[PDB]
Amino acid sequence: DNQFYSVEVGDSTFTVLKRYQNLKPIGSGAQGIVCAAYDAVLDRNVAIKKLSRPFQNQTHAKRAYRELVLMKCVNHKNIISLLNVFTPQKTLEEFQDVYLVMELMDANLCQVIQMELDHERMSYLLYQMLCGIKHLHSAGIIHRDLKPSNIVVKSDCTLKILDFGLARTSFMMTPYVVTRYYRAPEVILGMGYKENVDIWSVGCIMGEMVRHKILFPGRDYIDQWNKVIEQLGTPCPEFMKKLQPTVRNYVENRPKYAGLTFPKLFPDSLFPADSEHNKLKASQARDLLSKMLVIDPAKRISVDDALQHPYINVWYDPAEVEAPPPQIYDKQLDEREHTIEEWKELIYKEVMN
């Protein structure tokens, strides 16, 4: 007898606890392979993510460790939570893989982006990204890495945020390019950041939901900055005052743009606007977009003010907005350094307890 069985999914061997049957590959993004499965114990479908040798490098290890600790201690309906965690291997030396069991969602935002949402759904989705984000922030976690693939949705329009973003700290042998499209200027230009760095990302997603195309589709940070300033224009003088002379020199010496206006960037043809209701919602949609998509974060709308916005406020709920902050025991979580052997032991201790 063993508690586990093994089966192929694409070119991966899933070795899972017998309670999980009928594995369907629902995707293979960044962290590994993810399967849908039926869980005979709880009598429901779940998602199962396989981490292969998470401790193989310092990025995979810090992200995998961080993911485990946070997925345990945060309890909010807009952030995926762990149903179960396991490893098939019996001891620390044999130890290879970690399996994360999460509640199953129906899709991510990349798929929603290709649909035309009514205002009521779009406002709701966005309200839930806000509550998810506020919660993280109320516990010292700034994401800095929201994108459509890290945000999953249900058919009844419920939404959860998949991962916990970047830490406060690196090279990788991968075929997978990283997405920078949703990165805030203060991250791009490297000038330091605060809470509302995440609201640049939300504004990028929201703009994409409307226009059905990526707002700022650059191949590198240079090409990215170019696309930012074509659309929104060259930022004003007082923003430039905040850039280090090295980067400031570069920024200052780029071709200038007055930039497009929000009605021009986002015509009424893109929003439902047949009824008066829709007409009014559409102007409130642009109003908010014009406050999230501000380059100078001294002049960008904050999380709470966005929750306060008329387009959003429809759904406001204190139970959801001011849920008690998650308690994190690790406390050196964001900035800890270890070798790969030390990571293996930390991860293993986490999977085991």
| 28 annotated ligand binder | yes
| 26 annotated ligand binder | yes
| 224 annotated ligand binder | no
d(CA 23, CA 30) in angstroms, rounded, equals 19
| 29 annotated ligand binder | yes
Task: Please enumerate in sequence order all residues whose Cβ is within 8 A of that of 111, keeping only pairs 6 or more positions apart, or say none.
Answer: none
In the residue annotation, 145 being an active-site residue is answered as yes
| 327 annotated ligand binder | no
Choose among 138, 120, 147, 270: nearest CA to 201.
Answer: 147
| 37 annotated ligand binder | no
| 205 annotated ligand binder | no
Choose among 78, 41, 74, 51: nearest CA to 351.
Answer: 51
| 142 annotated ligand binder | no
d(CA 209, CA 116) in angstroms, rounded, equals 8
d(CA 120, CA 68) in angstroms, rounded, equals 34
The token duo for 135 is: 């919660």
Q: Would you give the distance in Å from CA 262 to the centre of its chain?
A: 25
CB atoms within 10 A of CB 196: 24
Q: Are 295 and 235 in contact (CB under 8 A)?
A: yes
DSSP E strand stretches across the chain: 4-9, 12-17, 20-27, 33-39, 44-51, 82-86, 98-103, 107-108, 151-153, 159-161
d(CA 20, CA 168) in angstroms, rounded, equals 36
The DSSP secondary structure of 60-75, one letter per residue, reads: HHHHHHHHHHHHHH--
Q: Which of 145, 156, 220, 305 is catalytic?
A: 145
Binding residues: 26-34, 49
Extract the annotated binding site for ATP.
26-34, 49
Which residues does the annotation mark as catalytic?
145
